[PDB]
Short mmCIF file of C-alpha atoms (C1' of nucleotides) and ligand atoms in Angstrom, two decimals:
data_model
loop_
_atom_site.label_atom_id
_atom_site.label_comp_id
_atom_site.label_asym_id
_atom_site.label_seq_id
_atom_site.Cartn_x
_atom_site.Cartn_y
_atom_site.Cartn_z
CA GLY A 1 -9.62 -22.80 -55.26
CA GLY A 2 -6.48 -24.62 -55.52
CA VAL A 3 -3.57 -22.74 -57.02
CA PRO A 4 -1.19 -24.78 -58.90
CA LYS A 5 2.45 -25.37 -57.67
CA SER A 6 3.86 -23.23 -60.53
CA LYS A 7 1.57 -20.65 -60.23
CA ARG A 8 2.30 -19.55 -56.63
CA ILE A 9 2.95 -16.09 -55.95
CA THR A 10 3.31 -15.86 -52.43
CA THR A 11 6.73 -15.29 -50.74
CA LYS A 12 8.99 -18.65 -50.35
CA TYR A 13 10.08 -17.98 -47.24
CA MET A 14 8.38 -18.82 -43.83
CA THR A 15 7.72 -15.51 -41.91
CA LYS A 16 7.34 -15.27 -37.91
CA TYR A 17 4.08 -16.11 -37.58
CA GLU A 18 4.05 -19.39 -39.66
CA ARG A 19 7.26 -20.41 -37.65
CA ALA A 20 5.27 -19.50 -33.92
CA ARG A 21 2.22 -21.65 -34.78
CA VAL A 22 4.02 -24.57 -37.03
CA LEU A 23 6.27 -24.72 -33.59
CA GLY A 24 3.50 -24.79 -31.36
CA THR A 25 0.91 -27.19 -33.27
CA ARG A 26 4.43 -29.59 -33.52
CA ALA A 27 5.07 -29.54 -30.09
CA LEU A 28 1.47 -30.00 -29.12
CA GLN A 29 1.74 -33.03 -31.37
CA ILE A 30 4.68 -34.36 -30.20
CA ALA A 31 2.99 -33.91 -26.54
CA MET A 32 0.04 -35.75 -27.63
CA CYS A 33 2.41 -38.68 -28.55
CA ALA A 34 2.81 -38.34 -31.98
CA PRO A 35 5.77 -40.13 -33.82
CA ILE A 36 8.89 -38.28 -33.77
CA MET A 37 10.12 -38.21 -37.44
CA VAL A 38 14.08 -37.13 -36.34
CA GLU A 39 16.48 -38.81 -33.75
CA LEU A 40 16.71 -37.60 -30.04
CA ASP A 41 19.84 -36.53 -27.98
CA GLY A 42 18.09 -36.43 -24.35
CA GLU A 43 15.54 -33.67 -25.13
CA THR A 44 12.20 -33.87 -23.45
CA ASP A 45 10.54 -30.28 -24.07
CA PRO A 46 8.55 -31.14 -27.14
CA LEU A 47 9.21 -27.77 -28.19
CA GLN A 48 12.77 -28.35 -28.46
CA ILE A 49 11.99 -31.28 -30.59
CA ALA A 50 9.70 -29.11 -32.56
CA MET A 51 12.65 -27.00 -33.57
CA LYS A 52 15.34 -29.70 -33.70
CA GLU A 53 12.79 -31.53 -36.28
CA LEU A 54 12.05 -27.95 -38.18
CA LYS A 55 15.76 -27.62 -38.52
CA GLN A 56 15.81 -30.77 -40.75
CA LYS A 57 12.53 -29.68 -42.33
CA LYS A 58 10.73 -33.06 -41.30
CA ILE A 59 7.42 -31.57 -40.20
CA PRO A 60 4.31 -32.67 -41.95
CA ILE A 61 1.91 -29.33 -42.05
CA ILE A 62 0.85 -27.99 -45.11
CA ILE A 63 0.36 -24.07 -44.53
CA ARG A 64 -2.76 -22.67 -46.41
CA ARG A 65 -2.22 -19.19 -47.11
CA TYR A 66 -5.12 -17.38 -48.08
CA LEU A 67 -4.65 -14.34 -50.49
CA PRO A 68 -7.32 -11.41 -50.33
CA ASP A 69 -9.39 -12.48 -53.22
CA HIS A 70 -10.45 -15.75 -51.05
CA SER A 71 -7.84 -17.96 -53.02
CA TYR A 72 -5.53 -19.96 -51.23
CA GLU A 73 -1.93 -21.41 -51.91
CA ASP A 74 -0.97 -24.82 -50.05
CA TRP A 75 3.21 -24.72 -49.32
CA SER A 76 4.73 -27.42 -47.33
CA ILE A 77 7.41 -26.84 -44.80
CA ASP A 78 10.15 -28.07 -46.68
CA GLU A 79 9.25 -25.90 -49.74
CA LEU A 80 10.03 -22.83 -47.24
CA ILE A 81 13.32 -21.77 -46.35
CA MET A 82 14.05 -20.94 -42.46
CA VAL A 83 15.20 -17.77 -41.41
CA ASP A 84 16.12 -16.35 -37.94
CA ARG B 1068 -8.40 -9.40 -3.87
CA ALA B 1069 -11.07 -9.57 -1.14
CA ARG B 1070 -13.17 -11.53 -3.50
CA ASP B 1071 -10.57 -13.42 -5.03
CA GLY B 1072 -11.18 -11.79 -8.49
CA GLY B 1073 -9.01 -11.96 -11.74
CA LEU B 1074 -6.81 -8.90 -13.34
CA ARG B 1075 -8.64 -6.91 -15.91
CA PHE B 1076 -7.25 -7.81 -19.46
CA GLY B 1077 -8.62 -4.37 -20.86
CA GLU B 1078 -9.08 -2.93 -24.07
CA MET B 1079 -5.26 -1.72 -24.54
CA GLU B 1080 -4.25 -5.02 -23.74
CA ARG B 1081 -6.09 -6.54 -26.45
CA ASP B 1082 -4.82 -3.14 -28.60
CA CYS B 1083 -1.05 -4.59 -28.43
CA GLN B 1084 -1.80 -8.32 -28.31
CA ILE B 1085 -3.11 -7.16 -32.09
CA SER B 1086 0.01 -5.50 -32.38
CA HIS B 1087 1.99 -8.53 -31.73
CA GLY B 1088 0.08 -10.72 -33.98
CA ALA B 1089 -0.64 -13.16 -31.57
CA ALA B 1090 -4.31 -14.38 -32.28
CA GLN B 1091 -3.83 -17.65 -29.95
CA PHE B 1092 -2.74 -15.55 -27.04
CA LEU B 1093 -5.80 -13.19 -27.67
CA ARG B 1094 -8.10 -16.24 -28.31
CA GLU B 1095 -6.87 -17.90 -24.56
CA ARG B 1096 -6.99 -14.70 -22.93
CA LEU B 1097 -10.34 -13.90 -24.43
CA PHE B 1098 -12.23 -16.97 -24.78
CA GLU B 1099 -10.80 -19.57 -23.21
CA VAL B 1100 -9.59 -18.66 -19.70
CA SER B 1101 -12.51 -15.95 -19.25
CA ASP B 1102 -15.72 -17.41 -20.00
CA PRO B 1103 -16.49 -20.49 -22.55
CA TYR B 1104 -19.43 -21.20 -23.63
CA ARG B 1105 -21.65 -23.97 -25.71
CA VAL B 1106 -24.69 -23.18 -27.51
CA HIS B 1107 -27.08 -25.31 -29.76
CA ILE B 1108 -28.05 -23.40 -32.92
CA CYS B 1109 -30.66 -24.09 -35.60
CA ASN B 1110 -29.29 -24.10 -38.85
CA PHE B 1111 -32.16 -22.39 -40.91
CA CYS B 1112 -32.94 -19.80 -38.18
CA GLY B 1113 -29.73 -19.01 -36.71
CA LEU B 1114 -31.16 -18.35 -33.30
CA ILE B 1115 -30.59 -20.58 -29.86
CA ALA B 1116 -32.27 -23.82 -30.08
CA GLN C 1079 0.08 2.76 -31.12
CA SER C 1080 3.20 4.29 -32.73
CA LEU C 1081 1.71 7.42 -33.37
CA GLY C 1082 -0.43 7.85 -30.02
CA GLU C 1083 2.48 6.66 -27.88
CA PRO C 1084 4.45 10.20 -28.63
CA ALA C 1085 0.94 12.10 -27.73
CA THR C 1086 2.01 11.06 -24.02
CA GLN C 1087 5.36 12.59 -24.26
CA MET C 1088 4.09 16.13 -25.65
CA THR C 1089 4.42 17.99 -22.50
CA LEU C 1090 7.74 17.97 -21.74
CA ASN C 1091 8.53 21.18 -23.61
CA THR C 1092 5.71 23.21 -21.60
CA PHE C 1093 8.11 25.35 -19.70
CA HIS C 1094 10.81 27.52 -20.83
CA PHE C 1095 8.85 29.42 -23.37
CA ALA C 1096 8.45 33.09 -23.95
CA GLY C 1097 7.51 33.87 -27.42
CA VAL C 1098 9.36 35.25 -30.27
CA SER C 1099 6.56 35.90 -32.96
CA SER C 1100 3.23 37.09 -32.00
CA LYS C 1101 1.30 34.41 -34.43
CA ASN C 1102 -1.49 32.35 -33.42
CA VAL C 1103 -0.72 28.79 -33.49
CA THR C 1104 -2.26 25.76 -31.80
CA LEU C 1105 0.47 23.52 -30.56
CA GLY C 1106 0.57 20.32 -28.91
CA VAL C 1107 -2.07 17.34 -28.65
CA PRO C 1108 -5.11 19.63 -29.16
CA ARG C 1109 -3.53 20.85 -32.54
CA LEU C 1110 -3.31 16.63 -33.20
CA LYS C 1111 -7.11 16.76 -31.87
CA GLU C 1112 -7.61 19.16 -34.89
CA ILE C 1113 -6.10 16.86 -37.52
CA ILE C 1114 -7.23 13.69 -36.49
CA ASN C 1115 -11.07 15.28 -36.14
CA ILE C 1116 -10.82 17.09 -39.18
CA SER C 1117 -11.98 20.32 -37.57
CA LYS C 1118 -13.74 22.42 -40.29
CA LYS C 1119 -12.89 25.34 -38.18
CA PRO C 1120 -9.59 25.66 -36.93
CA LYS C 1121 -8.44 27.32 -33.68
CA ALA C 1122 -5.34 28.98 -35.42
CA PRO C 1123 -5.69 28.91 -39.26
CA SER C 1124 -2.80 30.34 -41.04
CA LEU C 1125 -1.46 30.86 -44.57
CA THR C 1126 2.32 30.62 -45.39
CA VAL C 1127 2.63 32.99 -48.32
CA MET D 295 -48.56 4.08 -19.33
CA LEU D 296 -47.92 0.70 -21.46
CA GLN D 297 -46.08 2.75 -24.08
CA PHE D 298 -43.98 4.56 -20.88
CA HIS D 299 -43.64 0.88 -19.55
CA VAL D 300 -41.98 -0.69 -22.90
CA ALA D 301 -39.80 2.20 -23.84
CA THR D 302 -38.57 2.44 -20.71
CA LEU D 303 -37.98 -1.23 -20.59
CA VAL D 304 -35.85 -0.41 -23.80
CA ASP D 305 -34.44 3.17 -23.09
CA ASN D 306 -34.37 5.35 -20.20
CA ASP D 307 -32.06 8.14 -20.98
CA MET D 308 -33.79 9.92 -23.91
CA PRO D 309 -34.56 13.46 -22.99
CA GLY D 310 -38.30 15.02 -23.28
CA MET D 311 -39.46 11.59 -21.73
CA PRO D 312 -40.34 11.04 -17.70
CA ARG D 313 -37.54 8.69 -16.11
CA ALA D 314 -38.41 5.41 -15.00
CA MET D 315 -38.50 5.99 -11.25
CA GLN D 316 -36.88 2.99 -9.50
CA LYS D 317 -37.40 2.37 -5.51
CA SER D 318 -34.07 3.50 -4.08
CA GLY D 319 -33.66 6.85 -5.82
CA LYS D 320 -32.23 5.88 -8.92
CA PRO D 321 -33.26 5.34 -12.68
CA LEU D 322 -33.88 2.14 -14.18
CA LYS D 323 -31.01 0.62 -15.96
CA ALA D 324 -32.41 -0.47 -19.14
CA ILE D 325 -31.01 -2.90 -21.91
CA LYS D 326 -29.16 0.39 -23.42
CA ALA D 327 -27.59 1.23 -20.35
CA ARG D 328 -26.40 -2.27 -19.91
CA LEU D 329 -24.69 -2.38 -23.89
CA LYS D 330 -23.74 1.25 -24.04
CA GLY D 331 -20.90 2.37 -22.01
CA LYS D 332 -17.30 1.99 -21.07
CA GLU D 333 -18.24 -0.46 -18.42
CA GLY D 334 -21.01 -2.04 -20.49
CA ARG D 335 -21.41 -5.25 -21.96
CA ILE D 336 -19.52 -4.66 -25.23
CA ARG D 337 -16.32 -2.93 -23.94
CA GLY D 338 -16.28 -4.06 -20.30
CA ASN D 339 -17.42 -7.32 -20.87
CA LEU D 340 -16.34 -8.54 -24.34
CA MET D 341 -13.59 -6.64 -25.24
CA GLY D 342 -12.20 -6.28 -21.73
CA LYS D 343 -13.34 -9.54 -19.81
CA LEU E 389 -26.07 22.39 9.19
CA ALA E 390 -28.15 25.96 9.10
CA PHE E 391 -29.50 24.93 5.81
CA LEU E 392 -30.06 21.37 6.62
CA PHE E 393 -32.08 22.34 9.65
CA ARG E 394 -33.90 24.66 7.41
CA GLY E 395 -34.95 21.76 5.51
CA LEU E 396 -35.79 19.47 8.11
CA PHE E 397 -37.83 22.30 9.97
CA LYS E 398 -39.91 22.90 6.75
CA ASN E 399 -40.62 19.21 6.53
CA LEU E 400 -41.59 19.04 10.33
CA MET E 401 -43.96 21.91 9.84
CA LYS E 402 -45.43 20.47 6.86
CA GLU E 403 -45.86 16.99 8.56
CA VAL E 404 -47.55 18.87 11.63
CA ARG E 405 -49.79 20.70 9.49
CA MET E 406 -50.95 17.47 7.73
CA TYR E 407 -51.55 15.83 11.05
CA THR E 408 -53.52 18.89 12.44
CA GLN E 409 -55.37 19.22 9.40
CA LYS E 410 -56.46 15.50 9.28
CA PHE E 411 -57.57 15.88 13.01
CA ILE E 412 -59.20 19.29 12.34
CA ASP E 413 -61.75 18.60 9.60
CA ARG E 414 -63.62 15.75 11.95
CA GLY E 415 -64.16 18.67 14.76
CA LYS E 416 -62.21 16.96 17.29
CA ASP E 417 -58.94 18.41 19.24
CA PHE E 418 -55.35 17.18 18.91
CA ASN E 419 -52.60 16.27 21.02
CA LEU E 420 -49.33 17.85 20.58
CA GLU E 421 -46.92 15.39 21.51
CA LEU E 422 -48.53 12.91 18.92
CA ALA E 423 -48.53 15.37 16.41
CA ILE E 424 -44.57 16.34 16.20
CA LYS E 425 -43.05 13.20 14.60
CA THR E 426 -39.48 13.51 16.32
CA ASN E 427 -37.80 10.91 13.64
CA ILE E 428 -37.58 13.57 10.87
CA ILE E 429 -34.95 16.33 12.17
CA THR E 430 -33.09 13.19 13.73
CA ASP E 431 -33.41 10.84 10.59
CA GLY E 432 -32.51 13.81 8.39
CA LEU E 433 -29.57 14.89 10.06
CA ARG E 434 -28.23 11.34 10.73
CA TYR E 435 -28.72 10.53 6.98
CA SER E 436 -26.98 13.50 5.70
CA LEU E 437 -24.07 13.32 8.22
CA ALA E 438 -23.53 9.40 7.54
CA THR E 439 -24.06 9.29 3.99
CA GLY E 440 -22.71 12.73 2.87
CA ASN E 441 -25.60 13.33 0.38
CA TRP E 442 -26.45 17.02 1.09
CA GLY E 443 -30.25 17.12 1.00
CA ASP E 444 -33.49 14.96 1.07
CA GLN E 445 -32.98 11.23 1.04
CA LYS E 446 -35.57 10.82 -1.70
CA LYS E 447 -34.03 13.68 -3.60
CA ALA E 448 -30.31 12.63 -3.36
CA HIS E 449 -29.46 13.20 -6.90
CA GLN E 450 -29.72 16.52 -6.79
CA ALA E 451 -27.72 17.08 -3.95
CA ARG E 452 -23.82 17.31 -3.20
CA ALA E 453 -21.84 14.21 -2.21
CA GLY E 454 -18.96 13.97 -0.13
CA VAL E 455 -19.66 16.87 2.01
CA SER E 456 -19.41 14.54 5.12
CA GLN E 457 -16.32 12.35 4.98
CA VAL E 458 -14.94 9.63 7.49
CA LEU E 459 -12.17 10.84 9.59
CA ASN E 460 -8.74 9.84 8.43
CA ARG E 461 -7.17 8.12 11.19
CA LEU E 462 -3.72 7.08 10.11
CA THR E 463 -1.51 9.96 11.64
CA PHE E 464 -1.73 12.69 13.98
CA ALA E 465 -0.90 14.96 10.84
CA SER E 466 -3.93 13.24 8.67
CA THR E 467 -6.16 13.79 11.29
CA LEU E 468 -5.33 17.70 11.18
CA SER E 469 -4.93 17.84 7.59
CA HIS E 470 -8.71 16.42 6.94
CA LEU E 471 -9.92 18.48 9.43
CA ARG E 472 -8.57 21.53 7.72
CA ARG E 473 -9.65 21.06 4.33
CA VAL E 474 -11.52 23.09 1.99
CA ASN E 475 -13.25 21.56 -1.15
CA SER E 476 -14.16 23.37 -4.41
CA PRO E 477 -17.26 22.97 -5.80
CA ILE E 478 -16.01 22.47 -9.22
CA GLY E 479 -16.31 19.00 -10.51
CA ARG E 480 -13.17 16.75 -11.20
CA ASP E 481 -13.89 16.44 -15.12
CA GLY E 482 -13.09 20.10 -16.02
CA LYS E 483 -10.82 20.83 -19.11
CA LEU E 484 -10.14 24.21 -18.27
CA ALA E 485 -6.92 24.81 -16.18
CA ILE F 834 -2.16 20.68 -13.91
CA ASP F 835 -0.59 19.89 -17.60
CA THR F 836 -0.16 16.49 -16.86
CA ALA F 837 -3.68 16.01 -15.39
CA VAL F 838 -6.21 17.78 -17.72
CA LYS F 839 -4.63 16.30 -21.03
CA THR F 840 -4.25 12.52 -19.99
CA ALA F 841 -7.90 12.25 -20.71
CA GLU F 842 -8.07 13.24 -24.35
CA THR F 843 -4.55 11.49 -25.17
CA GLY F 844 -5.98 8.56 -24.22
CA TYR F 845 -9.25 9.02 -25.95
CA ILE F 846 -7.13 9.76 -29.13
CA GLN F 847 -5.34 6.64 -28.62
CA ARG F 848 -8.54 4.76 -28.27
CA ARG F 849 -9.78 6.44 -31.34
CA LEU F 850 -6.87 5.72 -33.72
CA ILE F 851 -6.55 2.23 -32.50
CA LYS F 852 -10.29 1.88 -33.17
CA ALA F 853 -10.03 3.28 -36.92
CA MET F 854 -6.96 1.02 -37.68
CA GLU F 855 -7.37 -2.13 -36.19
CA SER F 856 -7.76 -4.70 -38.68
CA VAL F 857 -5.39 -2.79 -41.23
CA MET F 858 -2.93 -5.76 -41.90
CA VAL F 859 -0.42 -6.53 -44.57
CA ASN F 860 -1.53 -9.38 -47.04
CA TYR F 861 0.06 -12.23 -48.71
CA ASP F 862 0.34 -10.34 -51.85
CA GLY F 863 2.35 -7.73 -50.12
CA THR F 864 -0.66 -5.09 -50.54
CA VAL F 865 -2.14 -3.53 -47.45
CA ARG F 866 -5.74 -3.98 -46.82
CA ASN F 867 -8.39 -3.19 -43.96
CA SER F 868 -11.20 -5.67 -42.71
CA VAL F 869 -13.21 -5.30 -45.84
CA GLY F 870 -10.70 -5.91 -48.39
CA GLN F 871 -10.39 -2.39 -49.80
CA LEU F 872 -6.93 -1.40 -50.73
CA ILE F 873 -5.14 0.96 -48.75
CA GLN F 874 -1.13 0.64 -50.16
CA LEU F 875 0.39 -1.40 -52.67
CA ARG F 876 3.44 -1.96 -50.36
CA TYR F 877 3.67 -1.36 -46.59
CA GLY F 878 5.22 2.25 -46.32
CA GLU F 879 5.46 2.45 -50.11
CA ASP F 880 8.24 0.11 -49.96
CA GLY F 881 7.29 -3.14 -48.32
CA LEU F 882 9.71 -3.15 -45.34
CA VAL G 442 4.82 -15.76 -18.90
CA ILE G 443 3.71 -12.45 -19.94
CA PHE G 444 4.78 -9.37 -18.22
CA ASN G 445 2.64 -6.08 -18.46
CA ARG G 446 2.52 -2.62 -16.70
CA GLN G 447 -0.77 -0.46 -16.85
CA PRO G 448 -1.46 1.92 -18.64
CA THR G 449 -0.39 -0.10 -21.89
CA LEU G 450 0.87 2.76 -24.53
CA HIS G 451 3.13 0.83 -27.17
CA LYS G 452 3.64 -2.70 -28.30
CA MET G 453 6.47 -3.21 -25.68
CA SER G 454 4.51 -2.67 -22.56
CA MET G 455 3.61 -6.46 -22.22
CA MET G 456 6.39 -8.95 -23.06
CA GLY G 457 7.46 -12.25 -22.61
CA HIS G 458 9.82 -13.46 -19.77
CA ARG G 459 11.16 -16.60 -18.14
CA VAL G 460 10.31 -17.45 -14.54
CA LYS G 461 12.80 -17.71 -11.87
CA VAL G 462 11.58 -18.06 -8.51
CA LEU G 463 12.76 -16.14 -5.93
CA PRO G 464 12.39 -16.13 -1.85
CA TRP G 465 11.11 -12.66 -1.22
CA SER G 466 7.05 -11.11 -2.22
CA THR G 467 7.65 -9.07 -5.23
CA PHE G 468 8.29 -9.51 -8.85
CA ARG G 469 11.72 -8.52 -9.63
CA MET G 470 12.74 -7.88 -12.96
CA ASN G 471 15.89 -6.51 -14.57
CA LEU G 472 16.76 -2.60 -14.99
CA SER G 473 16.84 -2.06 -18.52
CA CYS G 474 13.31 -3.45 -18.88
CA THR G 475 12.33 -0.23 -16.95
CA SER G 476 12.35 1.99 -20.15
CA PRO G 477 9.90 -0.08 -22.40
CA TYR G 478 7.68 -0.60 -19.40
CA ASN G 479 7.81 2.83 -18.15
CA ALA G 480 8.60 1.59 -14.60
CA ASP G 481 9.95 3.57 -11.58
CA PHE G 482 10.32 1.28 -8.79
CA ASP G 483 8.34 3.34 -6.40
CA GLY G 484 5.57 1.24 -5.44
CA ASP G 485 4.32 0.28 -9.07
CA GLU G 486 2.22 -2.63 -9.37
CA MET G 487 2.72 -5.07 -12.33
CA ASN G 488 0.60 -7.94 -14.06
CA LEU G 489 1.80 -11.77 -15.06
CA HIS G 490 -0.32 -13.66 -17.32
"C1'" A H 1 -24.39 -10.91 -2.49
"C1'" A H 2 -25.90 -6.50 -5.40
"C1'" A H 3 -25.80 -0.88 -6.40
"C1'" A H 4 -23.90 3.96 -4.93
"C1'" A H 5 -20.50 7.17 -2.48
"C1'" A H 6 -15.93 8.86 -0.68
"C1'" A H 7 -10.62 8.47 0.33
"C1'" A H 8 -6.10 6.77 -1.90
"C1'" A H 9 -1.59 4.16 -5.17
"C1'" A H 10 0.90 4.02 -10.37
"C1'" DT I 1 -57.46 39.00 -84.58
"C1'" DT I 2 -52.65 37.26 -83.33
"C1'" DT I 3 -48.06 38.41 -80.60
"C1'" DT I 4 -45.10 40.66 -77.21
"C1'" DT I 5 -45.05 42.08 -72.51
"C1'" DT I 6 -46.14 42.53 -67.52
"C1'" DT I 7 -47.43 39.85 -63.79
"C1'" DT I 8 -48.00 35.77 -61.00
"C1'" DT I 9 -46.89 31.41 -58.84
"C1'" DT I 10 -44.51 27.98 -57.83
"C1'" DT I 11 -39.66 25.84 -57.20
"C1'" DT I 12 -35.30 25.18 -56.07
"C1'" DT I 13 -31.99 26.27 -53.37
"C1'" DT I 14 -29.39 29.12 -49.40
"C1'" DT I 15 -28.34 30.36 -45.26
"C1'" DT I 16 -28.43 31.19 -40.86
"C1'" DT I 17 -30.44 29.58 -36.22
"C1'" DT I 18 -31.88 26.05 -33.25
"C1'" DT I 19 -32.04 21.45 -31.78
"C1'" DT I 20 -30.33 17.13 -30.78
"C1'" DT I 21 -27.07 13.81 -29.50
"C1'" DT I 22 -22.87 11.92 -28.26
"C1'" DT I 23 -18.46 11.79 -25.91
"C1'" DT I 24 -15.13 12.58 -22.14
"C1'" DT I 25 -7.07 7.67 -20.58
"C1'" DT I 26 -5.98 2.66 -18.34
"C1'" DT I 27 -5.12 -0.27 -13.53
"C1'" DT I 28 -5.67 -1.44 -8.49
"C1'" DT I 29 -6.74 -1.03 -3.03
"C1'" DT I 30 -9.63 0.10 1.05
"C1'" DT I 31 -14.06 1.81 3.84
"C1'" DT I 32 -19.49 3.32 4.91
"C1'" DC I 33 -24.57 3.31 3.82
"C1'" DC I 34 -28.89 1.34 1.84
"C1'" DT I 35 -30.98 -2.69 -0.17
"C1'" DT I 36 -38.34 2.21 2.18
"C1'" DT I 37 -42.62 4.63 3.51
"C1'" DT I 38 -46.41 7.22 4.49
"C1'" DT I 39 -51.57 6.55 3.08
"C1'" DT I 40 -55.61 4.17 2.59
"C1'" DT I 41 -58.50 -0.02 2.95
"C1'" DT I 42 -59.45 -3.89 5.71
"C1'" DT I 43 -59.95 -6.78 9.89
"C1'" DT I 44 -60.12 -7.73 14.57
"C1'" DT I 45 -61.00 -5.74 19.00
"C1'" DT I 46 -63.13 -3.50 22.96
"C1'" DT I 47 -67.19 -1.35 24.87
"C1'" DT I 48 -71.51 -0.27 25.40
"C1'" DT I 49 -77.11 -1.01 25.42
"C1'" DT I 50 -81.48 -3.71 25.45
"C1'" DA J 1 -76.22 -12.75 26.86
"C1'" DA J 2 -76.15 -11.17 21.78
"C1'" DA J 3 -75.69 -7.27 18.19
"C1'" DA J 4 -73.57 -2.56 16.50
"C1'" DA J 5 -70.14 1.45 16.25
"C1'" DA J 6 -65.22 3.71 17.01
"C1'" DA J 7 -60.22 2.86 17.51
"C1'" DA J 8 -55.84 0.21 16.64
"C1'" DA J 9 -52.92 -3.03 14.38
"C1'" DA J 10 -51.63 -5.31 9.35
"C1'" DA J 11 -50.91 -5.45 4.13
"C1'" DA J 12 -50.65 -3.20 -0.74
"C1'" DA J 13 -49.08 1.17 -3.16
"C1'" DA J 14 -46.10 5.02 -5.74
"C1'" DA J 15 -43.72 8.63 -5.15
"C1'" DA J 16 -20.73 20.33 -17.85
"C1'" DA J 17 -18.57 21.67 -22.33
"C1'" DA J 18 -17.40 21.02 -27.02
"C1'" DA J 19 -18.70 19.93 -31.95
"C1'" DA J 20 -21.08 17.70 -35.86
"C1'" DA J 21 -25.55 16.24 -38.50
"C1'" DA J 22 -30.07 17.24 -38.86
"C1'" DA J 23 -34.45 19.70 -39.23
"C1'" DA J 24 -36.74 24.28 -40.09
"C1'" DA J 25 -37.80 28.88 -41.45
"C1'" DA J 26 -37.24 33.42 -44.21
"C1'" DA J 27 -35.79 35.03 -48.14
"C1'" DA J 28 -34.26 35.05 -53.33
"C1'" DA J 29 -33.62 34.96 -57.56
"C1'" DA J 30 -34.98 31.95 -61.77
"C1'" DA J 31 -38.51 30.26 -64.86
"C1'" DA J 32 -42.48 28.57 -66.78
"C1'" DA J 33 -47.61 29.67 -67.39
"C1'" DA J 34 -51.77 33.27 -67.97
"C1'" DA J 35 -53.97 37.86 -68.85
"C1'" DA J 36 -53.39 42.49 -71.26
"C1'" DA J 37 -52.30 46.17 -75.23
"C1'" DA J 38 -51.33 47.05 -80.07
"C1'" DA J 39 -50.78 46.54 -84.78
ZN1 LIG K 1 -34.77 -22.43 -36.15
#
RNA sequence: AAAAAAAAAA
DNA sequence: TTTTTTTTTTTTTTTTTTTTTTTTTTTTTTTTCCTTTTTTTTTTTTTTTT
DNA sequence: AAAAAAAAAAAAAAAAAAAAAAAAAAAAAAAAAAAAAAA
């Protein structure tokens, strides 16, 4: 049940529950020796690198938001806009 | 303490971890660091094989 | 949780009570018990006419 | 006797029925006594491990 | 302890009665020292003082618990307060104030 | 006395309240639904904030 | 780490904290955290996960 | 090692 | 000789009583005591007799 | 010196208060069917 990109009705803003699991999954990926999409300035804790490449929206995660009628909308990271 | 036992992650802890909206902390404290197990299940009957 | 947490604090006004009206009214947590349980017989039914 | 033994294997707390007499002066702890309760298998071992 | 001695003396008389009825139906006599089982009174008082369940050992579920307690030896005042304690038989679950 | 008697029914009321509403969640369409998907509120708190 | 006082009444009764390793043997927390935990520092025991 | 009881702490 | 009118017999509800059943805050720390028992049957032993 | 009866040791056995929902029994009015009187 792939909803088209023009027909997405969910919010365009990443809430805290998406942010926590995206940061955790990306930190686990960097800790398991994935390539780092951005430059480095001496950060060693991979959760800091996870925020650092979340600022430039360079994280390859597709969030599959589930509507209550068991349909899903796929949103990229760069399609969402950070707020804190 | 005398039997070297862990802490009781009771019902109210589960309640307020639901209230925090943290699914992974609940899955950790209630499946990962308490009693994980793997079972083999028949697809047709759904029972332990 | 945000409705059950004030129920623990519904005993601080127990003292310094004398009563001005002689009207039967259930107050505090048992009155809460009358509204959560939907009691078909309340302890103090009253009409405000 | 067979019906009594089967039922008190399953359920030991039903009124009107003779209690399953364990050796040490206690009733039998049946499957229902394992599951039902605050310290049972649901509340004390699954919601609260 | 008087009530405990009533129960244990009744059990002793029942056991003595059963022994002498077993040995009277065969036409023989009996010995009084072999008739009295001395473990009954001693074992009953020892059990009901060590355990605290105030009654028969087989029927301890109908008996009151916590009548006999281990004496608290932490301070002298704790021992004096434990020796001068009064317990109400109302259970510790009553909503009535 | 008032601090002891109550605390039991207050905790029982809290457990009942948390068990009646443990799966009510704001969904991605803004509506508020329970575990079975039954609609409760079209917006959370009637304003979605 | 996750820091928890029992009984758990609301959401802020178990919260996240950062470990600072200190010399003696008690879990030393700040004073402004006494209000959400309902701690009293009179022999209160408290849990860490 | 289990079960029960009692005394307590917040 | 048929129609109305009284009687009967179910029929469904009502209402009150009785019975049943299920429930009783969260966590933590120490001891003590028991985890058989008398009864009945079976087997071995000891003494006595021819 | 061999065979039988009674006594003692060893082994298995059974013996609290509250509140809501459901079931039940006496009652009670209502409605349809059957029997009798009259025109
Ligand atoms: Zn199968």
